[PDB]
Symmetry: C3
Subunit: 421 residues, 3 copies
Amino acid sequence: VDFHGYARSGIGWTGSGGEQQCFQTTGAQSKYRLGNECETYAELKLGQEVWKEGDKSFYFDTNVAYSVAQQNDWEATDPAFREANVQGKNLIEWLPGSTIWAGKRFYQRHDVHMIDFYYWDISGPGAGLENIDVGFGKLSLAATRSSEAGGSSSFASNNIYDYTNETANDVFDVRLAQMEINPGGTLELGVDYGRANLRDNYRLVDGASKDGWLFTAEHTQSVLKGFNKFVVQYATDSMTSQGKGLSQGSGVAFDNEKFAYNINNNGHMLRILDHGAISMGDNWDMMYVGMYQDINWDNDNGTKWWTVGIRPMYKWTPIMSTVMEIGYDNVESQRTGDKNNQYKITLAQQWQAGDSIWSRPAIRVFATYAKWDEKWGYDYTGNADNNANFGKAVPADFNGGSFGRGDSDEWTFGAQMEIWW
Amino acid sequence: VDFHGYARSGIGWTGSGGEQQCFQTTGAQSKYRLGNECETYAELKLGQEVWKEGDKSFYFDTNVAYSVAQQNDWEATDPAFREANVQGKNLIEWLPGSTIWAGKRFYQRHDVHMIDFYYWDISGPGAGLENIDVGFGKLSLAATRSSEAGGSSSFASNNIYDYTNETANDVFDVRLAQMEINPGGTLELGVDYGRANLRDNYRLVDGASKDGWLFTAEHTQSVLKGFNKFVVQYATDSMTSQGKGLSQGSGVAFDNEKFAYNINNNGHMLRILDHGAISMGDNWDMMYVGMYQDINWDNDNGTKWWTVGIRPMYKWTPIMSTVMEIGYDNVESQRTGDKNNQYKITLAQQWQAGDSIWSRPAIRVFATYAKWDEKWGYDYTGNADNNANFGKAVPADFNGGSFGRGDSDEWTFGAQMEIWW
Amino acid sequence: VDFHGYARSGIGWTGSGGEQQCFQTTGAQSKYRLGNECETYAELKLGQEVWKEGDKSFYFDTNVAYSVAQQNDWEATDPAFREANVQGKNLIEWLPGSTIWAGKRFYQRHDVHMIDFYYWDISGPGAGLENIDVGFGKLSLAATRSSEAGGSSSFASNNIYDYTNETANDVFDVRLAQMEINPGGTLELGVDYGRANLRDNYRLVDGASKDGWLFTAEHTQSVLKGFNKFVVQYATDSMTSQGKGLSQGSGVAFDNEKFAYNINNNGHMLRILDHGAISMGDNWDMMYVGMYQDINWDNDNGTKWWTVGIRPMYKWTPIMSTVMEIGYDNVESQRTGDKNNQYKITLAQQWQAGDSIWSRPAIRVFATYAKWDEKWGYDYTGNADNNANFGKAVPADFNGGSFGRGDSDEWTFGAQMEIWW
C-alpha cells in the first residue's frame, strides 16, 4: 500500500473583518492561488502494485477527494470518488513499454500551478492504451466520458423544459508526446474529439453544438535549472465551454429551481499560454504565467481574458524562504465590450521541506492585498423562467441593478498548510 | 496496516446509442455479470493485527464502500460504512482455535460470483463465537441485527399509514461446518432464526409474519482442480422476502411519497442451487450455475425462478484469455402464471494476473448481446394511496399500460476492470 | 504511512424489548458510557513523516470520522472531515524543541474517558506554535476557528429572524504546561480568549455576548501506579454555552423550520473536576470521576450539575477482566430550582489486549441497569415562532405536558468492542 495525495488547509482573516475573502475576477476561470485559497481540499490516494512477473506488472490506484469549508471542527461532506483504475504495464508483447488501462482515472493532466488552472484534462471513467513507442516519441490513445445533467428530451418539442434527461458525452483522443525537436526541447501534440451520445429516439434542442474538436500543441524547453512551457490550443463548438477536453454538446443549463435555459456552445476558443519555473543564481527561484484566452460564440456571450503573473521566491536558509506573488487579470465581455480587471499582491514567509519552489510540505504565513474594478457581471436576477437575460453578461449598473464586485480593494492575512506527497 | 478490498469500474456503450444499458429479468433477484455491470463500485478495507502474544491475537478490520454511476470525474456520494469489528483469537483456553468477535462485520458470506448473488449472508452489526472445534467439524454461533424502515405503531390502529416507526429485527444462527462426509467432499449445515423486535407498547400490523426460519444445507465437493457446491435452502415467513439470512417481520413497505403499504411475506421459500468452477485440461476453465427458486406466499405475489449459466475461459498465454458467458433466466409469476425470460451472450477478451479463472485484477474488452421477452411486471403506477395494485405482479398489457420491458433485444460493448486484492 | 485511530461498535437490547436505548440525564452534558453507547463510531487517521533531516521533520496527519446507527449492514452516511494538518518539528533555529503547525487539527484535548467528556478542547481549523521551552515549563500558542450557523444580520433591525448569516468566532490560546511544583506532581495553566468576528456593516443582536474568556488550571499527580488530575475551570460570557473553549458570541439558535431564537449566554460558568485511574494491587485497577459544574446565566436558563462515578476492574488472568461501573448524576435547573437525577449500574465481562485498565482492543459482554427521576425538561413544543418558552427549562407537568423522562427504570444488555490503535 502506497500512500500519495494533495492537501491544503489553513486559517485566514479579512482586514475589514470576518473570515477570509477569495479574490477572483468576474469572468475569469481561475485565481492566483497564494493566500487566496479559502477552502480545505484534500485528495487521498491508496495505491498498490498487486502483481508482478519480471517487467510485467499490474498497478491498482484510487482517489477519494474531500472539500470542506474550514469553519468548524466537525464538517460533514459528500466525498468525491474520483479514481479507481487498473494499469497493466509492459503487458502487450509486440508493443514494448506500453500500458493498457481501464477504470476511472486522472489521465495525463496538464496544469498551471500558480493559478490552479488545468488547461488540458480529460479525466473520468475510461479506458486506453498508453505509451506506445513509435521510434521518435510516444503515442497514447484513450476513450473517456462526462455527462451533462440534462439537455436531452424523449420527444420532439420546441419547449426547453422538456429537455431534462441526462446527456452522455464521449471523448476520444490521440496524444503524440516526447518528440525531440531542438537540443533540450520537446514537443507534445494532441487531438481530442468529443460528441454527445444519445439513446435511440432521444433528441437535443435545435441548434445544439452536438460534437466538437480540441487541438493542443505544447513545446517544453529545459532552461536555467528548470523549464519553460509554451502551449497553443484551438477548440471548436462542444469543447469550448469546458475548454479542457471534456465535451458538452446539449447547450442546455439548469437553474436552482430546475428551469432549463440555453447556453449554446457554437463557435471557437483560442488559448495561448506560456508558463514555467526557473532558478536564478542559487538564492532565487521564480515561477511565472502569461495567458491569452479568447472565446468567440455565436450568441455573443463569450469572454476574452488576459492573465499575467510572477512569483519570485527568495531563500534565506534551505528550509526557510520568502515568497511574493504578483498577478494581474483583464477580462473583456464579448456581449458588451466592457472590461473587468484585478491585481493581487501577496507577500508570504514560508517554511518548506527542501529548498525548491516545487518542494512541499509548505507552511506559510501571508498577507494579500487585492484591488479590483468590475464594470460588467452575469445576470442571475430572478430565475430562468422570470428573466430573459439569465446567464448573460450585462453592465454593472444594468437596469438599476448591481452586477460584478464594483470598484473596491481589500486585504487578507493568515496561515496556510499545503502538501503533496 | 493491511490493505485489502474489491473494486469494479469501466466504460461502456449501447448498440442503439447512449451509455451502457444493464440487463436484468423483471422478477429476477440477480444478473449475469460479465459485461453487465454499469456501476463503479469499490470496497476499501484497512485491517491490522493490533496485538499478538503466542497463539493469541486481536485482529481489527474495517470496510468503507463507495458506489457511483460512472458518468463524470467529480461524483459525490454517500460512503456506506459496512464494517468495523474486532476479532480475538484463542482467548478462551478450553475452546482452542476459536475466535470471539464483536462489532460490524461480513460474517461468512456465501455467493455465486458469475451472477453476483449472495445466497447465505446475515451480515451486519453483531457479535459471536466462531470456529469452535467439536472434533468432527466446526461450530460457529452469532447474533446480528437488521431493521425495516417502518412497520411499527405505538398505538392500536387498523390504519396502515400509522405504522411508521422503525422495526428492529434480531437474527441468531447456528453454523455447523467442515464435516467430512465422503472422500474429497465436505458438508456444512446452517440454521438461522430471526424475529421482529419491538419496543414496549409498540406493535406490528394484524397478520404480520413477525418471525421465521432459514435452513441451509451445503455440500462442497472437490473435482477437476476446482469444486462443485450443491446447496439446498428452505425458509419460511419473515426470512422469505430478503431471502438470504435477514428477517423482515413487519410486512410493511414504503412508497416514494412515504405512504406505507402492506406487502406481507407469510409462506415459504425453496431454493435449490448448484454451482462451481472446474479446469478441463491446461487451456480451458469453466464456471457454471444452475438454480431453481420457488417463493410461495399467501398473498399470491411470489415468483418462481429458473436460471442457468456457463462461462468458459480459454487461455492463449499465461496472462491473456478469452471469456464466453452464456446465461438464461425464466421467471414465472405466482399471481398471473405468466413468464418473463431473457438470454445473454457475452464474448470478451481479457488480460489477467495469472492463469486461473479466479485470478484478479482482470482488464476486459467485451461485447454483450441480450434478448428478452417479458409478459408481466410490477404495478408501480401512481402511489400506494391511489393504486390498490401497488407492488403487485400484473400482465404486460394491464389496463392498456406497459409493464415489464416487453419483447426486444439490444447489444452493449465496452471495457472494464475487475479487481480484488 | 502510519495508521492510527479510535473505534467502537456492538449490538444490544433493552429489557422491555427493542434495540439498545442510551441513558443520559435531561440537562446533563455527558453519559456514563460503559455499556451505554448506541453508536458505531470510527475515526481513521493516516499519518506520515514525509520529510526528515537530522532533528528536523515534517509530519503530516489526517482524520476522517464516521458515525452510524448500528441498525443495518448498508448504512450510508456523511463522513466528517475532522482533521488534516502538517507539523514542522525543530525548524525554528533559536527555539529548540518547538513545533509549528497549520490546518484542521485536534489540539491539546483533555478528556474524562468514563463519561466521554472533553473539558478542554479548542480543536478546529487553525495554526500555532507549540512546545516553546521557557526552562521551567513549556509554552504553547495557537489560533483556531469555530462558526455559528447564523446570528449575524447585514442591516439594522430588531427582528430576530433577520439574523440568519453565519457568525465566525476566533479563539486565541495561551497554554503554559509541565511546571515542576512538587515531587511526582505537575501543573498546566491555560488562558483561552474568544470573540465573534463580523464582516463589515454586519451586526449581532442587541445585548449579544460577543466575546469571552476561559481560564483553566490542571494539576496532575502521579499516584498508585497511575494518576490523579485535579481541574479548576472558570469561563465567562460567550465561552459558557459550548463550555470547552470555543466561543459562541451570537446568542442565536435555530429550530427545525429555521426560526431564529435568542438563547443569550451572558454570565459565567464554574467547573470543578477530579478524575484519574490507579492500581490498588496487582489484580485490581480503578478509574474514577467527580465533578461540579455550575452555569449561571442572566436569562435564568442555566444548569447546576453534580456527578460522581467509579469504575473498579478485577483481573482474573492477563487478558480477561470483570469491569463494574457505578455512576450518579444530579442536575438542578436555574430557572425552576427542580432536580433531575439518575443512577446507572453496569456490570461487564471483558477480554482485552494486555493487563491494564487502559489496555484496548477490548471486547465486552455487559448488562446495564439505570433508574432516573426527572422533574424538569426543556420546552420544545411547537416552533420558536409560536412558543415563547422554546428552548427553556420547564417543570415535568407544564400545562399538562410531559417534559423530561419522568420516573422510570430500565435495563439493557449486549456486547460491544472498543479499540484505539
